[PDB]
Amino acid sequence: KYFGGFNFSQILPDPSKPSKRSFIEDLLFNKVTLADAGFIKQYGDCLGDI
Amino acid sequence: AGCLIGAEYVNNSYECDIPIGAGICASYQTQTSQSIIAY
Ligand SMILES: *[C@@H]1O[C@H](CO)[C@@H](O)[C@H](O)[C@H]1NC(C)=O
Ligand SMILES: *[C@@H]1O[C@H](CO)[C@@H](O)[C@H](O)[C@H]1NC(C)=O
C-alpha cells in the first residue's frame, strides 16, 4: 500500500466490510434514504397486520 | 426475485444468457442430459 505516499485507503474496498465496499461508498449509501418498495420478498410482511 | 421452479442450481459461474434478476442467469446446457441451469 505504498503508491508514492498517496493515501488510497478511503476509496479502496475494506476487507472487513462484508459488502466489499469502501468508506466513501458506505457514506454514499447512508446519505440516500432509498426505499426498496419490493426489492425483496415482503408479501409475508403485507399479510401480517400492523 | 422470487422462486424458480424447473431450473437446476449450479455452483459454477458463466456469462449471462437469460437474466433472471438479482444476479442470477439461466442457460440451456449439457449436464455432463441437457437441462436449464441457473447460476
Ligand atoms: C491513510 O489514511 C488513513 C486515515 O487517516 C490512515 O489511518 C492510514 O494510516 C493512512 N495510510 C498511510 C499509508 O498513510
Ligand atoms: C421466506 O422463506 C424462508 C424459508 O423458506 C424464510 O426463512 C424467510 O423468513 C421467508 N421470508 C419471508 C419474508 O417470508
Resolution of this deposited model, Å = 3.5
Identify the experimental approach: cryo-EM
The answer for residues whose C-beta is within 8 angstroms of residue A25's C-beta and 6 or more apart is A13
The answer for residues whose C-beta is within 8 angstroms of residue A7's C-beta and 6 or more apart is none
Cβ of residue A42 lying under 6 Å from some atom of ligand 1:
no
Cβ of residue A7 lying under 6 Å from some atom of ligand 1:
yes
Give the CA dihedral B24, B29, B30, B31, nearest 10 degrees. 10
Instruction: State the CB neighbour count (10 A cutoff) for residue B7.
Output: 17
Cα A41 from Cα B5, distance rounded (Å): 16
